[PDB]
């Protein structure tokens, strides 16, 4: 049942990807 834990891992990886980009936007906006 390697297949569907793999789906959850990927759902996490995707959420992380989008969070990283949003963080980067905030980083730029707070910076000088």
């Amino acid at each position: 049942r390697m297949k569907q834990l793999e789906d959850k891992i990927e759902e996490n990886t995707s959420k992380i990807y989008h969070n990283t980009n949003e963080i980067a936007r905030n980083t730029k906006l707070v910076g000088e």
Copy 2:
């Protein structure tokens, strides 16, 4: 041993959830 990798996946999902909410707070605070 599907059970405890599943625990780690969930520990990650939880950490992501809280990060997403904190990011959203920062997004609002940087915005106009």
Copy 3:
């Protein structure tokens, strides 16, 4: 094949760790 899904879980955990620290930097910078 518990071993390499475990590698991906860890790649996620590491990405989360670094995101949490970057968020914390932004939180401090937006705060009063």
